[PDB]
Amino acid sequence: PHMFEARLVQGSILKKVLEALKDLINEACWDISSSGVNLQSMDSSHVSLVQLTLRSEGFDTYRCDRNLAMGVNLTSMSKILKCAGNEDIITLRAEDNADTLALVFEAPNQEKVSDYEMKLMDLDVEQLGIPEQEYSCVVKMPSGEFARICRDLSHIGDAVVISCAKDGVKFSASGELGNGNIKLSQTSNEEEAVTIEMNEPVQLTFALRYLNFFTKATPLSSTVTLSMSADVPLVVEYKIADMGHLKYYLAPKI
């Protein structure tokens, strides 16, 4: 009794989720309930926050008797998920007062099963709360294009200015080599679209080194959404299959 178990057929979702977290967040609390898996954590600088949601429905079987909170070293967990093949069925199992998580990997079409037992840890955890927000500008664009832009501008400077207007969205940086602007225009013609919805024009400045951690989520989705308003953190959102999302929040520079 008081036992969590969840079976995910696309084990690679979970491998990719941990590669998209482990370099930004060392260790976090996984909040498990009957609605699903929730994770919320600031990086140690408190400049950025990550929000992961995986709904119960995404799992091929899912049981959560009692709510629980597992403290996980994300680096430890990423190392264990590297022993899963990309098409393994992955089961997570935990007892409600347990010091360990069990991970079972079933190789598809093959009599091979792997079992790992990972030690948990106890974790102090601030609870942040983000309210409902109307964003002055929302940009949907290919995830590969955003990853390219953040990588390329990081060779020009440490900071990017993001401007949204009617024409479209512009990304700018400058440094000791010179200056760069990249302009994406709204696409007239599904995945390849750049879509801008804006109420008021916005211009914010952000640290490129954090954006380059966010784009480690690029394998989870072929698109990304950027949401911006004049005095508040940027949101960068990647959708995960049809079962949830990974959201990155980043405080603007000054």
Partner: peptide
């Protein structure tokens, strides 16, 4: 110094 996430969205 730096603007922080907690400057817009404080702890509860």
């Amino acid at each position: 110094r730096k603007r922080l996430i907690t400057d817009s969205y404080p702890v509860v």
